[PDB]
């Protein structure tokens with residue numbers, strides 16, 4: 001009675017997919033900084049969604065509104081071949097991203113790919129080549145067709161294009177195209193989240209709660225600071241901070257250093273804090289009585305307040321040595337250090353209390369980047385898994401699943417093509433990128 005409301009919602013979906021994915025593709029094409037191995041795979045993923053929104057979803061909406069197929073038999077064997085192609089090439093790309101992110105975090109070059117940009121193009125071509133054989137060869141050679149009468153009536157009729165497949169195809173094609181790359185993706189990327197948390201480091205811990213500024217700034221106390229929380233001087237003079245900066249770097253800096261020399265200062269200060277923990281008589285027994293995680297929290301305090309200041313927590317150092325983490329967490333809260341900087345002290349106290357990195361989960365920028373990739377994979381799973389689960393259940397018990405439920409679940413996977421550009425807005429780098437492109 002009212003197909004307009006359904007038709008308008010469908011028209012807004014096609015527009016959101018074409019606009020959103022062309023926006024992602026152009027950002028990677030125009031900006032030199034975005035040319036990376038991951039964004040190459042993002043382009044392959046965005047191209048799959050673009051062909052989805054151009055050549056698949058519009059004809060799928062016309063098929064629903066007209067209750068028939070008005071584009072002929074040739075286009076539908078193609079429309080179905082393209083539809084299966086974009087879903088296969090999407091899950092395989094995600095599987096390649098999860099595997100590529102695994103080797104990046106297990107390598108010494110943490111968060112950086114072991115592939116060159118030319119190898120990434122070779123993998124993408126192979127992905128579409130293998131996906132092309134999986135999607136086109138069964139459809140064009142008619143390896144999918146069923147044998148019953150209702151299916152043969154739809155094949156011989158040009159105005160009917162319901163996707164009837166035999167049970168062997170619906171079982172095999174779902175497993176080889178979707179389930180196998182999905183299970184590998186979920187398993188491998190589950191390990192990336194484990195390694196990111198397990199390989200969490202005091203150098204990344206201090207980077208999180210003190211940031212990085214390669215130009216001179218003032219900290220919460222007003223003192224001049226540069227790098228990763230490297231105190232230059234407590235004097236209000238700016239030449240004094242600049243003069244002390246030149247002595248540490250060995251160069252007239254004018255208050256500006258690079259990241260290569262900012263980390264060298266950071267590595268010096270961390271070693272200075274550790275060397276001060278071992279020399280101090282009060283901190284030495286506590287440090288030897290701690291695991292690697294709680295050792296990092298103790299160096300975090302010494303990094304911020306100095307060796308003499310951390311030794312002042314007389315009671316807290318008793319119980320951190322006495323393995324009584326919960327009691328030490330309360331005394332650490334009752335301190336000027338908690339009142340001064342509570343968000344940092346909260347993360348340190350939690351580290352002392354739980355002995356884990358729960359307070360620094362997804363705080364590092366690279367770990368934020370890995371979380372968004374997890375949302376792309378998780379949302380893709382939630383949108384297509386009900387459809388593919390119903391595929392298998394329909395094969396076992398044929399009478400159970402109606403086509404109204406089948407089309408509904410298929411379109412939940414259809415709207416997934418527009419979610420990727422929205423999820424990429426979690427990145428400040430794409431956010432700046434599309435602001436430039438949209439001229440905002």
Ligand SMILES: CNC(=O)[C@H](Cc1cccc(Br)c1)NC(=O)[C@H](Cc1ccc(C(N)=O)cc1)NC(=O)[C@@H](c1ccccc1)C1CCCCC1
Nearest residue numbers: 024027031033034368369372373424426427428429430433
């Ligand atoms: C070595 N070169 C880099 O690392 C450049 C450098 C850079 C920085 C700032 C502006 C520009 Br222009 C370029 N960063 C980039 O290439 C960023 C790095 C990044 C930063 C923060 C986050 C997060 N928190 O989710 C995520 C990634 N990549 C991205 O955003 C990409 C991306 C991939 C996966 C999830 C979300 C975003 C693309 C999203 C879609 C369009 C194109 C980007």
Ligand SMILES: CC(C)CCC[C@@H](C)[C@H]1CC[C@H]2[C@@H]3CC=C4C[C@@H](O)CC[C@]4(C)[C@H]3CC[C@]12C
Nearest residue numbers: 040043044047048051055082085121124125128
């Ligand atoms: C038969 C028709 C309908 C299917 C459409 C196939 C198209 C969209 C496929 C075929 C080859 C694919 C390309 C293969 C290699 C690359 C290199 C990479 O840096 C960006 C993506 C890009 C450029 C792919 C995008 C999608 C692609 C162009």
Ligand SMILES: CC(C)CCC[C@@H](C)[C@H]1CC[C@H]2[C@@H]3CC=C4C[C@@H](O)CC[C@]4(C)[C@H]3CC[C@]12C
Nearest residue numbers: 025026028029043047050051052054055056082
């Ligand atoms: C296949 C038919 C039916 C639909 C239209 C296909 C379009 C969307 C495909 C075919 C080839 C694709 C291109 C292949 C290669 C590149 C280079 C890359 O650096 C940016 C994306 C870009 C430029 C792709 C954009 C999308 C593209 C033009």
Ligand SMILES: CC(C)NC[C@H](O)COc1cccc2[nH]c3ccccc3c12
Nearest residue numbers: 080083084087088163170173174177410
């Ligand atoms: C309107 C119909 C044609 N749409 C198809 C789905 O969007 C995507 O379907 C699949 C993608 C990848 C592998 C697949 N194996 C199948 C077996 C039966 C039905 C769909 C699929 C399928």
